[PDB]
C-alpha cells in the first residue's frame, strides 16, 4: 500500500476491485479522470497499453484490471489455499471476463437492438457458475473453496450489473440468487454498496445499463 | 501429470501451452476433436463454458486457455521469483490476450476487408512489448525478470503468428525481433517448431492466416 485507482468516473472494470479493497478493510485514493482530461491526450501515451485503469500499490504501477485483481488476491491472501484452488479461481475469473466482454459490447455498440437476444442467451452463460456453486459444498460457501477470493468479487459485480439489465435473470438460478444475497450482505460490502461514491457512479460511460 | 490437451486440430489457443510443455521437457497427449464431431453437439454440453481447450492434469480438469497457462506456470515454476514479478507477468499476459482477441476477430470475421487496417494499427499495439523489454535489462533477457515464464511462451506465439500475417511487422522493433530469434533458438522450442505435428497443424480453423 498505499493504493490509488486511476479511472474514468464509472464503475466499469473497477467496481470489483473497489469492493475487494472495501471488504478487506483497505482504504485507497481515487484519481478520477474526466473525458475532457483524457481527450487532452497527455495521460493516455504514458499508459502502457493506452488505457485505464491504472493502479499504484506503493512502488508498483499496474495496468489491466484482471492483473490488478490477481495482484490483490495474491497479496491479500485471496487466491486459495493451494494450486488446485488457484487454477479453479483463474478458470472462474476468465469465464467472468468473457461474459463481461460480451456485456460491454452490448452496452456500447448495440444496446437498443441487441438487448433482447442478449437477455435471451444469458441463462446459458450463467449456467456454468450455477454448476460450479452446486459442485462446491452445495452452493453454500464461495465460488471456489471455503474462503472468499478475488474471483468472488468479480463474479458478484458481474451478477449485480446483470440484475440491473435483466431483473429476473437469476430467478431460475437458486444458488446464484442466494450467493448474490449472501455476499451483498457482508458488512463491509453492504456499506460500500450504499456509499454515495458507489451509488452516484454510473455503471457504464454512455448512460445505458 | 499425465497431461492431456483436448482441442480442435489447429494451433490457435493451444500452441503457446504446447511450446511451454515441450520446453520444460514434458510430454502430453493430444486428444483431437474434429469440427464435424463438434457439430454433432454431444461434447459441447459437457464443457464448462461450452468451449475448448479442455486440459487434464492428472485428476484436475481445466478449461480456459489462460487459466491452463497460469496453472502450468504455477506448477512448473514459471511465474517469477516474487509477487511483483507475478503481477508484471499477469499484466503482460493480459496485454497479449487483448491483441490475440483482436487477431481472432480479424481472422474469423473480417479478413479480406479489415487486414490492411489491422496491419496499419499493429505497430501501436506492439510498441508496449518493446518498451517492456527495454525496461528489463535492455531487452537482453525475458519479458519479465531473468527467468522464462508462462507469459514468454504466450507472447512468443502471438509474435510468430503476426509475422505470418504481416511479414516484416517486427522490422522497426529491434528488441522484439531479437527476442523472437533468441527464444526460437532454444533447442526444445526449435525442435518443436520444426516438428511435422506443429508444421502440419493450421494456425486457425478457417484456413486464413
Ligand atoms: N483489458 C483492459 C481494458 C481496459 C479498457 O478497455 N479501458 C477503457 C475504458 S473501460 O472500458 O474500462 O471503461 C479505456 O481506457 N479506453 C480509453 C481509450 O481506449 O482511449 C483492462 O482489463 O483493463
Ligand atoms: N476464453 C476461451 C475461448 C475459447 C474458444 O474461443 N474456443 C473456441 C475454439 S478456438 O477459437 O479457440 O479455436 C470454441 O470452442 N468454439 C466452439 C464453440 O463455441 O462451439 C479460452 O481462452 O479458452
UniProtKB/Swiss-Prot annotation, chains A, B:
Domain named GST C-terminal: residues: 82-203
Annotated positions of the N6-acetyllysine modification: 127
Keyword Phosphoprotein set for record: yes
Residues that bear Phosphotyrosine: 3
CDD domains for this protein: GST_C_Pi, GST_N_Pi
Keywords of this entry: Acetylation, Cytoplasm, Lipid metabolism, Mitochondrion, Nucleus, Phosphoprotein, Transferase
Residues that bear Phosphothreonine: 61
Tissue: Ubiquitously expressed.
Enzyme Commission number(s) of this protein: 2.5.1.18
Modified-residue entries (N6-succinyllysine), positions: 102, 115
GO CC aspect terms: cytosol; mitochondrion; nucleus; protein-containing complex
Catalytic reaction(s) noted: RX + glutathione = an S-substituted glutathione + a halide anion + H(+); prostaglandin J2 + glutathione = prostaglandin J2-S-(R)-glutathione; prostaglandin J2 + glutathione = prostaglandin J2-S-(S)-glutathione; prostaglandin A2 + glutathione = prostaglandin A2-S-(S)-glutathione
GO molecular function, one term: JUN kinase binding
InterPro entries: Glutathione-S-Trfase_C-like, Glutathione-S-Trfase_C_sf, Glutathione_S-Trfase_N, GST_C, GST_pi, GST_superfamily, Thioredoxin-like_sf
Function: Conjugation of reduced glutathione to a wide number of exogenous and endogenous hydrophobic electrophiles. Involved in the formation of glutathione conjugates of both prostaglandin A2 (PGA2) and prostaglandin J2 (PGJ2). Participates in the formation of novel hepoxilin regioisomers. Negatively regulates CDK5 activity via p25/p35 translocation to prevent neurodegeneration.
Protein's UniProt name: Glutathione S-transferase P 1
Source organism: Mus musculus (Mouse)
Gene label: Gstp1
Amino acid at each position: 500500500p498505499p493504493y490509488t485507482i486511476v479511472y474514468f468516473p464509472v464503475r466499469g472494470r473497477c467496481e470489483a476491485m473497489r469492493m475487494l479493497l472495501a471488504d478487506q478493510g483497505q482504504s485507497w485514493k481515487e484519481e478520477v479522470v474526466t473525458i475532457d482530461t483524457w481527450m487532452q491526450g497527455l495521460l493516455k501515451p504514458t499508459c502502457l497499453y493506452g488505457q485505464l485503469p491504472k493502479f499504484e500499490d506503493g512502488d508498483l504501477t499496474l495496468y489491466q484490471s484482471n492483473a490488478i485483481l490477481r495482484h490483490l488476491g495474491r497479496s491479500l491472501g485471496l487466491y486459495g489455499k493451494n494450486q488446485r484452488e488457484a487454477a479453479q479461481m483463474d478458470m472462474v475469473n476468465d469465464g467472468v471476463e468473457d461474459l463481461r466482454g460480451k456485456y460491454v459490447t452490448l452496452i456500447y455498440t448495440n444496446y437498443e437492438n441487441g438487448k433482447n437476444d442478449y437477455v435471451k442467451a444469458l441463462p446459458g452463460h450463467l449456467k456454468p457458475f450455477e454448476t460450479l456453486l452446486s459442485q462446491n459444498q452445495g452452493g453454500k460457501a464461495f465460488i471456489v473453496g471455503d474462503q472468499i477470493s478475488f474471483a468472488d468479487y468479480n463474479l458478484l459485480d458481474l451478477l449485480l450489473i446483470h440484475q440491473v439489465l435483466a431483473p429476473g435473470c437469476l430467478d431460475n438460478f437458486p444458488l446464484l440468487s442466494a450467493y448474490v444475497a449472501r455476499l451483498s450482505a457482508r458488512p463491509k460490502i453492504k456499506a460500500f454498496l450504499s456509499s454515495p461514491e458507489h451509488v452516484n457512479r454510473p455503471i457504464n460511460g454512455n448512460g445505458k445499463q
